[PDB]
Amino acid sequence: ESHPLTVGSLRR
Amino acid sequence: ESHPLTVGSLRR
Amino acid sequence: SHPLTVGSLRR
Amino acid sequence: FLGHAENPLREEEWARLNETVIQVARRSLVGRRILDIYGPLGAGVQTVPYDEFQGVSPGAVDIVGEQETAMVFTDARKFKTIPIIYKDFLLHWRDIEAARTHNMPLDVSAAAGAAALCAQQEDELIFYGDARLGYEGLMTANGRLTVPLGDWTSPGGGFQAIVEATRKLNEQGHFGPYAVVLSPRLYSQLHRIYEKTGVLEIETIRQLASDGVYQSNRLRGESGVVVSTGRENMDLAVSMDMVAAYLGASRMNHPFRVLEALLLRIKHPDAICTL
Amino acid sequence: ENPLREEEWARLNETVIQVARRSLVGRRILDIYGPLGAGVQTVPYDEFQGVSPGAVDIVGEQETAMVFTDARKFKTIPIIYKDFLLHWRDIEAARTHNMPLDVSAAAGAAALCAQQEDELIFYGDARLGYEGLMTANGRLTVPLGDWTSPGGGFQAIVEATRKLNEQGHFGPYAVVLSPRLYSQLHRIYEKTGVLEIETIRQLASDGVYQSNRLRGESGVVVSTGRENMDLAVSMDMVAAYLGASRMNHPFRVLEALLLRIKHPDAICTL
Amino acid sequence: ENPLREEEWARLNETVIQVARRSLVGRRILDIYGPLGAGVQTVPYDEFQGVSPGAVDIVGEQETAMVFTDARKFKTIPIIYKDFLLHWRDIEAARTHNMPLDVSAAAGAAALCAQQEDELIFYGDARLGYEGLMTANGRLTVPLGDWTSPGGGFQAIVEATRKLNEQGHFGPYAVVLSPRLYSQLHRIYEKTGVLEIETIRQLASDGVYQSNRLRGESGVVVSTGRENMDLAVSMDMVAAYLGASRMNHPFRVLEALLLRIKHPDAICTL
């Protein structure tokens, strides 16, 4: 919503 | 409410 | 938001 | 206040629950059949005037009234507080969900259980005071005018014992339509073989007491009472009558509670007798 | 699910507000950072001894160091609360039979709440750990002693004022004393027909004040502006309903408060 | 305000994103708490402990104490950055001849930013009070030095597993090691048999990873699930100006992260 995520959430 | 008297007056 | 209630009790 | 909003049951289940509690109460009570009640005052009342004490003042008749017939009390009034009695009542959260789409009837057995316990508490209160609140009761008044009995397993010794008790009531200048309440073993042993002078002793005792002999489990083992049922000698005060109200929204279930506010007023502690 | 209707609710709020306003002394000497809403629960804290003597320079400019927070860090806004109780039969009675609806318990709760708040401002929590006006760091102690002479309640204050001024920190001062000595400050016979407290008052220019929350033998002087002492409210003193239970009714009055001393140069103590 | 047109912005962002994804190792074994945003500045660093064994009975009443917290502390979230330049001439050339802009400096910046961020996750600084995996307290250490002889080696890992279970922790483990011992572990030696990363990887089931950012003899084991760790993100890899100096063009790449070990029990080290 507020400047969506770009790089993160590789696996866990 | 304040005056239903559901179960009373058992003939005494 | 919520308004002040008790007050400021000046300075 | 009661529930009747944000509550599980719908109207029909409410009606069934109320009917169950009323019916089991009306079967259970053996004290509210001997003391006429002061009508439903209302929820908010918490104190009632408690008329002090006794007199033996007789009314008088003359050609012109100058006897002055003073119904007089000069000490105090000493109002008293109206207690509350209750017992818990819990169903489940799953059973209502069943009663939505499953076996439709919803068991309310807990209602009968709770109301029966509450009414037993009634008759324990009316027949006995308690130290913590310092109230009064039929076998725990002061100046009761007692008399020993000690003559049962006899043909009819209970008859002469109750006659002695009635005579003691009469000596104090207080008589009328009597009433009797008795304990289990006595009420059975007196219900025994006829008194070799007619029929079962109960019929003689009823033609004597003339307002019914009644049974009460909650009374002690070997005692009994006689009263003068007339008003202005004993009374019962109600704030609200036995009813069931939604309590809260505990862990997942829905516990309820049954209420009633009562107090007896032994205005004239001369209508008593015990062992 | 409010048990009470509008008028009774309003009477309860008016009572709690009135007792608070009467019994509060701290919020008469400090200025509030605006009502932030209930959601926020953190604030930035301070800036101090960023000594930058200043710059002159002709049609040009040197390269002095800008003034800014000594070290950016935050604090969390505590919550202080009291709880009173009601009964359902009393509410029914006040609804029908006898109609004042006693509100004594609310007043007791509000008194306790305001006392806790003022104790907080004048004394930090030892267990959690905050700053107290009596226990801040860099307080510029001045000997408040050697009284019980006809003059002497003036020497201490003037010494404290020169100590603030020496640190280049001045303005309309304000003063708060413990009740014993504030009462004892009526040593009026200074030289002529004027009250020692009143001449102190014209020196301070924002009023000497009474606050029982002090210990026996203490008092302060401050500088009533912003940018020196600030008070941050998340929400004022309101009455909240905790939900029915046992058919009774519980209740709770809430405060979300924290002061932050930006500039701990405006202090004097014993 | 910003010379770089839309397409150049897109190119810059894709390059920094791609190098970031290729570079980070810490952000593979830590689920992230969502994009809080720019405005937020501190996060509820929440828990310390708590185990509620729980139970089930037919009716549904068993009195199990739920877990909310032990002690809130609210630490802030720092900022991570590096920076590079463009030499305006190239920006002009890439509008006539060299159509795709040359951004090797952007990769140079992103690599170093990711390296520093990794160092932050794997190590504290104590200059802002940030705990780290090999410096935190409550790490459940265990002596391990028996290596340089492949006849062993895993026993440290199995001891770590059993000791991590005894504190009530199960689930998918994970191992991260320093390159010296990592290369020590891939060795093929007498008794050959097999290597060891397959054994350790199977026993860990969430990957044995590499990081040059550790010391010479480090190594840890974790329990990757949520409700034990997290990663708090305000902003992620983005670029922005730094003004315009000497007709050149500087830039800066940002992100505001903070490790929060909610459950500082699921750790093991040397």
Short mmCIF file of all heavy atoms in Angstrom, two decimals, chain D residues 6 14 33 59 96 100 107 115 118 126 138 183 219 221 237 248 251 255 266 272:
data_model
loop_
_atom_site.label_atom_id
_atom_site.label_comp_id
_atom_site.label_asym_id
_atom_site.label_seq_id
_atom_site.Cartn_x
_atom_site.Cartn_y
_atom_site.Cartn_z
N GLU D 6 -27.83 -8.93 22.38
CA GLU D 6 -26.52 -9.58 22.22
C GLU D 6 -26.44 -10.87 23.03
O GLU D 6 -25.50 -11.10 23.80
CB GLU D 6 -25.37 -8.62 22.56
CG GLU D 6 -25.40 -7.99 23.95
CD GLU D 6 -26.18 -6.69 23.98
OE1 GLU D 6 -26.74 -6.31 22.93
OE2 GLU D 6 -26.24 -6.05 25.06
N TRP D 14 -36.22 -18.55 25.04
CA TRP D 14 -36.42 -17.75 26.25
C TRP D 14 -37.70 -18.15 26.96
O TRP D 14 -37.72 -18.35 28.18
CB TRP D 14 -36.46 -16.26 25.91
CG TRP D 14 -35.18 -15.55 26.11
CD1 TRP D 14 -34.49 -14.84 25.19
CD2 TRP D 14 -34.42 -15.48 27.32
NE1 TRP D 14 -33.35 -14.32 25.74
CE2 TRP D 14 -33.28 -14.70 27.05
CE3 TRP D 14 -34.59 -16.00 28.60
CZ2 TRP D 14 -32.33 -14.43 28.01
CZ3 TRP D 14 -33.64 -15.73 29.55
CH2 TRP D 14 -32.52 -14.95 29.25
N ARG D 33 -46.03 -20.95 50.61
CA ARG D 33 -47.41 -21.39 50.71
C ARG D 33 -48.02 -21.11 52.07
O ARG D 33 -49.21 -21.37 52.28
CB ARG D 33 -47.51 -22.89 50.40
CG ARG D 33 -47.80 -23.20 48.96
CD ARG D 33 -48.39 -24.58 48.80
NE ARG D 33 -47.36 -25.61 48.88
CZ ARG D 33 -46.84 -26.22 47.82
NH1 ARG D 33 -47.24 -25.89 46.60
NH2 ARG D 33 -45.92 -27.15 47.98
N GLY D 59 -58.97 -4.13 71.15
CA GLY D 59 -59.97 -3.16 70.77
C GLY D 59 -61.10 -3.13 71.77
O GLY D 59 -61.36 -4.10 72.49
N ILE D 96 -25.90 -24.84 21.14
CA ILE D 96 -26.74 -23.89 20.42
C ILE D 96 -26.48 -23.99 18.93
O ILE D 96 -27.41 -23.93 18.11
CB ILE D 96 -26.50 -22.47 20.95
CG1 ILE D 96 -26.91 -22.38 22.41
CG2 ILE D 96 -27.28 -21.47 20.13
CD1 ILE D 96 -26.48 -21.12 23.08
N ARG D 100 -29.01 -24.87 15.85
CA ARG D 100 -29.23 -24.06 14.66
C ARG D 100 -29.45 -24.94 13.43
O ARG D 100 -30.47 -24.80 12.74
CB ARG D 100 -28.07 -23.10 14.44
CG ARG D 100 -28.07 -21.95 15.42
CD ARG D 100 -29.20 -20.99 15.14
NE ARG D 100 -28.99 -19.71 15.82
CZ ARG D 100 -29.40 -19.44 17.05
NH1 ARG D 100 -30.06 -20.34 17.75
NH2 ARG D 100 -29.16 -18.25 17.57
N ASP D 107 -31.73 -28.86 25.01
CA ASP D 107 -31.91 -29.26 26.39
C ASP D 107 -31.61 -28.11 27.34
O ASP D 107 -30.63 -27.38 27.15
CB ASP D 107 -31.01 -30.45 26.71
CG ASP D 107 -31.25 -31.00 28.09
OD1 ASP D 107 -32.28 -31.67 28.29
OD2 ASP D 107 -30.40 -30.76 28.97
N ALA D 115 -32.71 -23.73 39.36
CA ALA D 115 -33.87 -23.18 40.03
C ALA D 115 -34.23 -23.99 41.26
O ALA D 115 -34.63 -23.44 42.29
CB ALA D 115 -35.04 -23.10 39.07
N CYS D 118 -31.92 -22.92 43.94
CA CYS D 118 -32.27 -21.59 44.42
C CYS D 118 -33.46 -21.63 45.36
O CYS D 118 -33.47 -20.96 46.40
CB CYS D 118 -32.56 -20.66 43.24
SG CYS D 118 -33.39 -19.15 43.71
N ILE D 126 -35.72 -18.64 54.85
CA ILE D 126 -36.92 -18.31 55.62
C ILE D 126 -36.96 -19.10 56.91
O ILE D 126 -37.38 -18.59 57.95
CB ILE D 126 -38.18 -18.54 54.77
CG1 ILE D 126 -38.34 -17.42 53.75
CG2 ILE D 126 -39.40 -18.58 55.63
CD1 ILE D 126 -39.49 -17.61 52.82
N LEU D 138 -37.69 -18.54 61.42
CA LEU D 138 -38.77 -19.08 62.23
C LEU D 138 -38.24 -19.89 63.40
O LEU D 138 -38.74 -19.77 64.52
CB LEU D 138 -39.70 -19.92 61.36
CG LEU D 138 -40.89 -19.16 60.80
CD1 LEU D 138 -40.44 -18.08 59.85
CD2 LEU D 138 -41.83 -20.11 60.09
N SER D 183 -40.79 -31.93 59.89
CA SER D 183 -39.59 -32.58 59.37
C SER D 183 -39.91 -33.96 58.82
O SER D 183 -40.90 -34.58 59.20
CB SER D 183 -38.55 -32.71 60.48
OG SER D 183 -38.73 -33.91 61.19
N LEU D 219 -35.70 -28.32 56.54
CA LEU D 219 -35.74 -28.20 57.99
C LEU D 219 -34.91 -29.32 58.62
O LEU D 219 -34.62 -30.34 58.00
CB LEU D 219 -37.19 -28.22 58.46
CG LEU D 219 -37.57 -27.94 59.90
CD1 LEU D 219 -38.97 -27.38 59.92
CD2 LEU D 219 -37.54 -29.21 60.69
N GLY D 221 -33.69 -32.29 61.48
CA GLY D 221 -34.18 -33.65 61.58
C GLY D 221 -35.46 -33.78 62.40
O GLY D 221 -36.40 -34.47 61.99
N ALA D 237 -41.61 -10.08 51.87
CA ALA D 237 -41.39 -8.91 51.03
C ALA D 237 -40.60 -9.31 49.79
O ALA D 237 -39.53 -9.93 49.90
CB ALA D 237 -40.64 -7.82 51.79
N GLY D 248 -23.10 -13.30 31.22
CA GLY D 248 -21.91 -12.86 30.52
C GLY D 248 -21.55 -13.77 29.38
O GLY D 248 -22.32 -14.65 28.99
N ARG D 251 -15.73 -18.12 28.59
CA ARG D 251 -14.66 -18.57 27.71
C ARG D 251 -15.10 -18.77 26.27
O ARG D 251 -14.57 -18.12 25.37
CB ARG D 251 -14.09 -19.89 28.23
CG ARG D 251 -12.99 -19.74 29.26
CD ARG D 251 -13.53 -19.28 30.60
NE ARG D 251 -12.47 -19.21 31.59
CZ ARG D 251 -12.25 -20.14 32.52
NH1 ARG D 251 -13.03 -21.20 32.58
NH2 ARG D 251 -11.26 -19.99 33.39
N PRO D 255 -22.88 -18.51 30.34
CA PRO D 255 -23.47 -18.75 31.66
C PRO D 255 -24.56 -17.75 31.97
O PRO D 255 -24.43 -16.56 31.68
CB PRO D 255 -22.28 -18.58 32.60
CG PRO D 255 -21.42 -17.62 31.92
CD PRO D 255 -21.55 -17.91 30.44
N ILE D 266 -41.00 -11.07 60.69
CA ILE D 266 -41.74 -11.68 61.80
C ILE D 266 -42.12 -10.53 62.73
O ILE D 266 -41.49 -10.26 63.75
CB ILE D 266 -40.94 -12.78 62.50
CG1 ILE D 266 -39.55 -12.29 62.87
CG2 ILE D 266 -40.78 -13.94 61.58
CD1 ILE D 266 -38.91 -13.12 63.93
N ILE D 272 -45.05 -18.53 67.29
CA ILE D 272 -43.99 -19.50 67.06
C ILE D 272 -44.13 -20.64 68.06
O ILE D 272 -44.66 -20.47 69.15
CB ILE D 272 -42.61 -18.83 67.16
CG1 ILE D 272 -42.48 -17.70 66.15
CG2 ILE D 272 -41.49 -19.81 66.88
CD1 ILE D 272 -42.61 -18.18 64.74
#
